[PDB]
Amino acid sequence: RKIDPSRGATLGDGSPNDMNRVEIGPTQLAFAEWHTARLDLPDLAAMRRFRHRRLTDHVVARGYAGLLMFDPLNIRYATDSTNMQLWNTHNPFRATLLCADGYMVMWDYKNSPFLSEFNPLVREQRAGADLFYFDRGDKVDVAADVFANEVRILLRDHAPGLRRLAVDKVMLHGLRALQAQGFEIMDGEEVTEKARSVKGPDEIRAMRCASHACEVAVRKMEDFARSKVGDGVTCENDIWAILHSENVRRGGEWIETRLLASGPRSNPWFQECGPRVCQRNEIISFDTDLVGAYGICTDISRSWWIGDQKPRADMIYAMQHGVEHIRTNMEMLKPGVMIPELSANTHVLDAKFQKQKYGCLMHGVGLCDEWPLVAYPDHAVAGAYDYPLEPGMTLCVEALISEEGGDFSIKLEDQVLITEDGYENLTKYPFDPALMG
Amino acid sequence: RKIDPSRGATLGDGSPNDMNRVEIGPTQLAFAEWHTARLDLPDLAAMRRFRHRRLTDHVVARGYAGLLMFDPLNIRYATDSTNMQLWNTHNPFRATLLCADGYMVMWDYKNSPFLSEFNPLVREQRAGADLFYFDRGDKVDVAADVFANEVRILLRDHAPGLRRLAVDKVMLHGLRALQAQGFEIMDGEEVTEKARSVKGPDEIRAMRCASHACEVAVRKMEDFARSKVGDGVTCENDIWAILHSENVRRGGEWIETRLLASGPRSNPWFQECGPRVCQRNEIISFDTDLVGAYGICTDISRSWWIGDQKPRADMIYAMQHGVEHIRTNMEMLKPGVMIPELSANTHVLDAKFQKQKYGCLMHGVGLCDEWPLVAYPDHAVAGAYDYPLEPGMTLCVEALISEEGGDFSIKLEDQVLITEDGYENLTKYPFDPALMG
Ligand SMILES: [Fe+3]
Ligand SMILES: [Fe+3]
Ligand SMILES: [Fe+3]
Ligand SMILES: [Fe+3]
């Protein structure tokens, strides 16, 4: 029983053409829409090999024994295997070890070792890396020592004579157990963030797919908003719910924030989506901050005017100003440009917008928001991000246009790829023609 | 402009009756359904005071200076303030300090100090507790020292002469900075898990509300499944999407797992919801694992038979066996019973079910899955959970009924409150009458 009977043993992305397979991934709906958009599918095996080769190279360039990962998103990067991802972000039951020779082990939940079997780069599946109070009570230490010894033995074999173990984040008991085995603990996030920083050819294809799925879901949310707002019952949550459903229907995973806000609730920014019944002749501003198809994040922001009357002239000005902000900064994007050059040379927002502008003008994106962060010059920390842009980096370009004490904020954001010769904006979503004038 | 014009300055839960308020919470839809079910609303101010008094008492009983929390769910428990919760679970930008005298400080995202203002128990709002590589690059240490000094100064004033600082989870750089200020770092999760372990009168009311909202959302998912399955397009994700939407429409927050599985994909258990097109005459088994209204978790599980033909006799047997398992174990619930007594005296699953049974027979629940864990005797760790049940504890009672190499699994789960005299099952959701026979 096939997911695509109109194909052989595999899907166009190399995954098993079997409706009864363990693996999840995009839905028929999403595949259909991408075929129509004529988007090349990612070869998942190749994508996974690329990530593992790159991550392994990073461990070796640093002279480390290995990299031990407890962050679910780092685990995803290294193995592409999901397991109760959201539960995992705050209950650290999983671990992945990447040894300097490329050898990779997964400690998974005790009763689900099969979840990472589809990726033969994961050489072993074990249990017992769960070193928190909920899972072990007053008996975490015994287990911490068992686990740490396992790590020691693995790296004696796969990284003989190396003492430095990068760890992304670990529970205190785990840290001390690892130290008691003789490991010098290094910052794992500097390793993973820099590895994640450059996408390979299949990661690009994947992001193209995810981005499209996200945009279709956003359009569905817009359709619903423009059709319901004014009925005196449809709230911010009702609208936002369309983005949740339509992301899931395309094989998406979750939404990182609650950044949808209507009317006066959009200034100051960062107020959360909730029960406010929306109204005609108001701006709705939102940011997708979305983990979608193939586990790829689409992080884009738009502001919408729903109403028959024209918007106030300051709304139109703010909108056009955000668009100019994004498009100007985007033009700076080229390989070899340093991050702080981007900080220095940012397009300058008007005075009434400086105080409440966004925490950065750009940031990385992959499986979620990622390194680097490109802060505005008045916040840039010297020596913090002294690195060049490289081809394959994918960044979100931001604009928050928010008057101090103001009535509304414009939030705009596009997702862009760095190429050999410059950049390529991956976002196709239109700007609201009424807010653009 | 009021959220409930049919009321004064406040909602029935004490929150501001203003559609333009910063605070989120349940929707008109959810409030309507709870009024009809005649459910008393939680007094939020009182709920928040109860949690703070209890958490503070725990810090003091231990002789600690304070408790520093970076886990978003612990922050929620202490302050009830949300901010990009899911982003926060894996990018630690927030911190809450609870001093031994009750004094409480929030370090929030640099541009959103207002988010915790609605809770005057949060005495200060600062920034700069964000000590990870994405937010700070190669300059985390400078900031780690600034933050750690702030903590030192606060506890000199609010906990003079005390050196022990419980921390739930912290980044390595933060840990060393705190140690360099002279703090003895203790396990924060033993503090928070034990505080969270007992709910007050308003937390109970809140959970009653959340549980109802979750059940209505599940019914909506059932309606949709029973009406669409067989159409040859409706997949696991399509069905699951109804739970996402309908939780959000009631002010819910997120779903911790992907535990919905159709047909043969339900054995082994822990396979994830995905693109498999569902079919008539198959079991769908699922677990809500849901963070709903008022931020309260409803964690329940059901199995459904959709089809005109009767289910196989082993499915009916498995179902009845799970129900017996849950109802028998539930009968053990009383204050003063020790956790390992529950382990020892569990109802015994049949032989064909022992190998693949669930990781526990019971666990705590509050803002998510919580301490304690009640493991089956063949996994129980002696001395790990030597504690009595107390009134106000709220536990989920589990049954996974899964034949080794089998065709399907039955997953059932109810959420229960411990009372003075025994227990009270809070779950009202029916069992599938076709699977019950
Ligand atoms: Fe964003
Ligand atoms: Fe962004
Ligand atoms: Fe559950
Ligand atoms: Fe459970």
Residue numbers in the entry:
A (entry chain A), B (entry chain A): 9 to 445
Article sentences:
Marine microbes are key in DMSP cycling by catalyzing its cleavage into acrylate and dimethyl sulfide (DMS), thereby releasing ∼300 million tonnes of DMS per year. The DddP family of DMSP lyases is distantly related to the M24 family of metalloproteinases. We were able to crystallize and solve the structure of a putative DMSP lyase from the DddP family, RdDddP from the marine bacterium R. denitrificans Och 114. Comparison with the amino acid sequences of the putative and the characterized DddP lyases showed these metal binding residues are invariant throughout the DddP family, and therefore likely critical for the biological function of these enzymes. Together, these results provide strong evidence that DddP lyases are metalloenzymes and that iron may be of relevance to the cycling of DMSP by marine microbes.
